[PDB]
Nucleic acid binder design. Structure first.
Length: 1062
RNA sequence: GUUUUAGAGCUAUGCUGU
RNA sequence: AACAGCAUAGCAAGUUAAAAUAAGGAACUUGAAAAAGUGGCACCGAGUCGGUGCUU
């Protein structure tokens, strides 16, 4: 019908949900297979999937290769031959036959040994007049005389063999060229991916500093001599060092225990990069990928100082100049060494043993070794002017080919192709006809698996992408091959692992330190605060503010933190951002004025001076002070409004764009009479902050530890928000919906007056905050509350979008729904013996002294050295192992984590051949979940005072809710886990500590949820007592149990009963 | 970075041979 | 004499291109495999999902 699917892709889960126009989750029926009679079943459309990482055939069939690029080359040269064949059979004669047979010696040629034309004359003359290829190419470029079709063929083959990369899309231009703008892009990406400890480059002419002709060390040092805040050992210093050709290290910045050396010119680059990334984390995979575009530009600048003409390759001019210089130095050096200092001449030009000059040209000698060897002679030689500096400048006797013929955009090549074709349009009639096609093939650049492998990242995300694609295909096949109207994609942020929770504290500690030493106030001396206390927002802002209120000149008291209030410089009605850059402290928020704009001018005039000594201390940023004094330049403008719109609705991560492109290409396939792509399935991408604030605002709280439902919860919410946005603002689709859409402007979205023009024009909105229509009342910065219509409808078509009374109840029901599927992906592992996978075998064994045989079933563990021999002849294998009369048909392969269930619906998970794991999940009511979260967050409410006090009364009324949650876990434990002594200790301790404060009770109940937690048994702590794990050694009760084959998503289930077999 | 083939080497001396 | 192969003693000089790449001491069905397929529709309820109607 009308429906949608949200997704949330991470390293540990894939969520999925299905909604309708009213935002209801359908509930349907599916068939049951197996051997019992549990025919009736019915499920929801909400679930999640989990898989464990590790080396596996899946992890290998997503690897890196080259043979494929090589065969791409062979098919493209074959295509060249295909194009040339017909017109040569129509122009040349034995042209093609002689060129293929070139390896044969002069007794079986059956033709003439001169492949150029057929005479001995041209042959040597060819390279005599065209020694370096650039001669030939330049000749075609600026020559109007006739040429040989075969020489054009060879030249064209050369340019396509060395074509380049595709790291930049579109035609070349200053936007995607030059140096300074790319440096600006790098610093902007750094300053975006961090919120802390920034770097400001105010109009530094980076091109003149980086493109200057210096050594590989001095060019690094040159910019490092600026940017005071950073050091050469910093991450930025390592980045800039990497993007020139040195060998930096990656140890100290990421605190790793293994040395990491990486170099772009080195062949093994990507393998080291992805190993590093999979070690550290995938959020940082946007800082190295912005230096591979700066090093390319820098090398282009280094090679192309020249550009005498316009219709030439400046690289070609530079290269031919280099060859001429190489010849000239050949002659001079030759003369000097042979004449002036006659000895050692053989040692330099003929020895070839210690890699002299001839050894460097012909032998396996390297440039650095050659320079080291030739240093002493040049040092001790007389008349060495104009030579020594160019030695360590690396510009002596340079080969025309080095490690820099990859860094090379294909636009220069295609432009020279176009120039050559234009020069020779008419002589060959097919050149004009097929110029478009040859351009198309030489610019032209697979399958779903190959595209998934194409993204540069750790294998975890790639596995997640593959599983996402399979989940999408399954979901679209459930609904009768009907395509959706909206599919939101949203990335799952990784929660802090308590390691990065300290590093940010250290960074803000550095901030407060540098401010305190720059200014000189003894705030730290009067009050000692450590990083465990920097986590307090009000305290850290108090230290940021030196201890003085900014709207009124008076010192702030320390121990009256309850009375103070936190405000926003930008009112939340205009923009929703809560970070430190837009949070300040004051006695009361009533000093801002009576307007809704940035604060009044009457305040800034008084404490301008205070704000200068705040800003020059580097403790606040330029953008922060810009928002502080936004009122002096007129106020809010259309450019600023569009800026906030784009910051709130437009993404910056390219990997999300990549996966969105993958799904858009995979699903959207229909076309029209023209060559336009009919985009019937829209793909919408959002940030996490929207859903986070939605939950925080409308009290749909989420807890992660209780069970695995939160992934699917976020999956539902994201699609819910996305459909409302697309249905509310159709014209803003070009901002977040992917595709080549029609651009728009800033004048049509912004009105002139709030109440005098709002709701009186076709224009959408006036307040810059997009998410205001989610709410029912909009609070202003002055205390006035606005009223929104009960039913929200689109003014253009006339269709409703939002129902206040129905949608909230439906969403609350969806969150309170108790039956949500979770599934663990079963896989076979590929690659103190280790068991690859166990087997189930029925056979006859000897029990007693008379060797009397009886048929049994036992769990035998095949080792990793044994699986192939098991495959070849399991009958005699098991006969040698100790079994007799094995049933080949009844032998069933069992991998790790196979689902077994017993009476009363209890489920068990297999861990090894002699141990077991839990296999059931707890379901808890939404009200109890809410109470648990609120009790855990009594001090960390981080909300308005009225909401906070209402919540604490809510907590303190329902003191019995503790009693029936302890009850709830008790009967469930007695039902399933059967750990009697353990329940005995837990309830004894609980009755012991009944009267202790509700807070301290809360997190310890959360800890006690570990017994019901899914996975291997694990120890935990109560208030003061410890509980040790109870391994499930017995493996007999699984013999009469039942096998349930749980699917990839949980939709289809088939159950096999082990009691009937054997 | 690796392996072969084709890019007529010259002058003066001596040697074997067809 | 011409030429091939040798022992000299000196003099003039370098970057392109096809080829090669691994004997290394979830569950089910048809198919070797690439790959094809397998699980009905509405209503009222809601403790791991239940009931009713139509229809395979």
């Amino acid at each position: 019908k009308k429906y949608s699917i949200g997704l949330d892709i991470g390293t540990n889960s894939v969520g999925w949900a299905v909604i309708t126009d009213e935002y209801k989750v359908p509930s349907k029926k599916f068939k049951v297979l197996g051997n019992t009679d549990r025919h009736s079943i019915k499920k929801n459309l909400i679930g999640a999937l989990l898989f464990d990482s590790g080396e596996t055939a899946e992890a290998t069939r997503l690897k890196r290769t080259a043979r494929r690029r090589y065969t791409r080359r062979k098919n493209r040269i074959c295509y060249l031959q295909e194009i040339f064949s017909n017109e040569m059979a129509k122009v040349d004669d034995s042209f093609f036959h002689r060129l293929e047979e070139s390896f044969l010696v002069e007794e079986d040629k059956k033709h003439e040994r001169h492949p150029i034309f057929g005479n001995i004359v041209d042959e040597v003359a060819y390279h005599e007049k065209y020694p370096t290829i650039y001669h030939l190419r330049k000749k075609l470029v600026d020559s109007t005389d006739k040429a040989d079709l075969r020489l054009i063929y060879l030249a064209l083959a050369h340019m396509i063999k060395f074509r380049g990369h595709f790291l930049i899309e579109g035609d070349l231009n200053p936007d995607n060229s030059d140096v300074d703008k790319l440096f600006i892009q790098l610093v902007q990406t750094y300053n975006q991916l961090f919120e802390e400890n920034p770097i400001n480059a105010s109009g530094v002419d980076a091109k003149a500093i980086l493109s200057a002709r210096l050594s590989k060390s001095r060019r690094l040092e040159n910019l490092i001599a600026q940017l005071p805040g950073e050091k050469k050992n910093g991450l930025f210093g390592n980045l800039i060092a990497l993007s020139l050709g040195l060998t930096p290290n990656f140890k100290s910045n990421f605190d790793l225990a293994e040395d990491a050396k990486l170099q772009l010119s080195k062949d093994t680059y990507d393998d080291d990069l992805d190993n590093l990334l999979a070690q550290i984390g995938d959020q940082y995979a946007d800082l190295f990928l912005a230096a591979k575009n700066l090093s390319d530009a820098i090398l282009l600048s280094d090679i192309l100082r020249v550009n005498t003409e316009i219709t030439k390759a400046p690289l070609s001019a530079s290269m031919i100049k280099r060859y001429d210089e190489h010849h000239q130095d050949l002659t001079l050096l030759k003369a000097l060494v042979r004449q002036q200092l006659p000895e050692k001449y053989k040692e330099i030009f003929f020895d070839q043993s210690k890699n002299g000059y001839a050894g460097y040209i012909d032998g396996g000698a390297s440039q650095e070794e050659f320079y080291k060897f030739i240093k002493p002679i040049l040092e001790k030689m007389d008349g060495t002017e104009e030579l020594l500096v160019k030695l360590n400048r690396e510009d002596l006797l340079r080969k025309q080919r080095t490690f820099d013929n990859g860094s090379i955009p294909h636009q220069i090549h295609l432009g020279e192709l176009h120039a050559i074709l234009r020069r020779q349009e008419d002589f060959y009639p097919f050149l004009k006809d097929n110029r478009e096609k040859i351009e198309k093939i030489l610019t032209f650049r697979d399958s779903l698996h190959e595209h998934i492998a194409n993204l540069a990242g750790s294998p975890a995300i790639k596995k997640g992408i593959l599983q996402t694609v399979k989940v999408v295909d399954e979901l679209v096949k459930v609904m009768g091959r009907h395509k959706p109207e909206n599919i939101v994609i949203e990335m799952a942020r990784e929660n802090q692992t308590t390691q990065k929770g300290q590093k940010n504290s250290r960074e803000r500690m550095k901030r407060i330190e540098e401010g305190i030493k720059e200014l000189g106030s003894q705030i730290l001396k009067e009050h000692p605060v450590e990083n465990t206390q920097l986590q307090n927002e009000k305290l850290y802002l108090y230290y940021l503010q030196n201890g003085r209120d900014m709207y009124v000149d008076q010192e702030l008291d320390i121990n009256r933190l309850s009375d103070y209030d936190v405000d926003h410089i930008v009112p939340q009605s205009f923009l929703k951002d809560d970070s430190i850059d837009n949070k300040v402290l004051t006695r009361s928020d009533k000093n801002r004025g009576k307007s809704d704009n940035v604060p009044s001018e009457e305040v800034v005039k008084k404490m301008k001076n205070y704000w200068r000594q705040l800003l020059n201390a580097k403790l606040i940023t330029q953008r922060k002070f810009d928002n502080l004094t936004k009122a002096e330049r007129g106020g809010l403008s259309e450019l600023d409004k569009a800026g906030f719109i784009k910051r709130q609705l437009v993404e910056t991560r390219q990997i999300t764009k990549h996966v969105a492109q993958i799904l858009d290409s995979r699903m959207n396939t229909k076309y029209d009479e023209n060559d336009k792509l009919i985009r019937e399935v829209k793909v919408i991408t959002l940030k996490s902050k929207l859903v986070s604030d939605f939950r925080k605002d409308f009290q749909f709280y989420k807890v992660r530890e209780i069970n695995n439902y939160h992934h699917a919860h976020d999956a539902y919410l994201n699609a819910v928000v996305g459909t409302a946005l697309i249905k509310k603002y159709p014209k803003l689709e070009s901002e977040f919906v992917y595709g080549d859409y029609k651009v728009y402007d800033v004048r049509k979205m912004i009105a002139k007056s709030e109440q005098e023009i709002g709701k009186a024009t076709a224009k959408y909105f006036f307040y810059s905050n997009i998410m205001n229509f989610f709410k029912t009342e909009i609070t202003l910065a002055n205390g006035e509350i606005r009223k929104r219509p009960l039913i929200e409808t689109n003014g253009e078509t006339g269709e409703i979008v939002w129902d206040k009374g129905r949608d909230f109840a439906t969403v609350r029901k969806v969150l309170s729904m108790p039956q949500v599927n979770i599934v663990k992906k079963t896989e076979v592992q590929t690659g103190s013996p280790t068991v690859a996978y166990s087997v189930l075998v029925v056979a006859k064994v000897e029990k007693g002294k008379s060797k009397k045989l009886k048929s049994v079933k036992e769990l035998l563990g095949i080792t990793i050295m044994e699986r192939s021999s098991f495959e070849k002849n399991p009958i005699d294998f098991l006969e040698a192992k100790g079994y007799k009369e094995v049933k080949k048909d009844l032998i069933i392969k069992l991998p790790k984590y196979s689902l077994f269930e017993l009476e009363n619906g209890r489920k068990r998970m297999l861990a090894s051949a002699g141990e077991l794991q839990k296999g059931n999940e707890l379901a808890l009511p939404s009200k109890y979940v809410n109470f648990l979260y609120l009790a855990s967050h009594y001090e960390k409410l981080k909300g308005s005072p009225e909401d906070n006090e209402q919540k604490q009364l809510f907590v303190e009324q329902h003191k019995h809710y503790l009693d029936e949650i302890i009850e709830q876990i008790s009967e469930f434990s007695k039902r399933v886990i059967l750990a009697d002594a353990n329940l005995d200790k837990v309830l004894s301790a609980y009755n012991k500590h009944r009267d202790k404060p509700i807070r301290e009770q809360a997190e310890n109940i959360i800890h006690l949820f570990t017994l019901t937690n899914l996975g291997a048994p694990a120890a935990f702590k109560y208030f003061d007592t410890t509980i040790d794990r109870k391994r499930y050694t017995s493996t007999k009760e699984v013999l009469d149990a039942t096998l349930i084959h749980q699917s990839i998503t949980g939709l289809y289930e088939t159950r096999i009963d082990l009691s009937q077999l054997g």
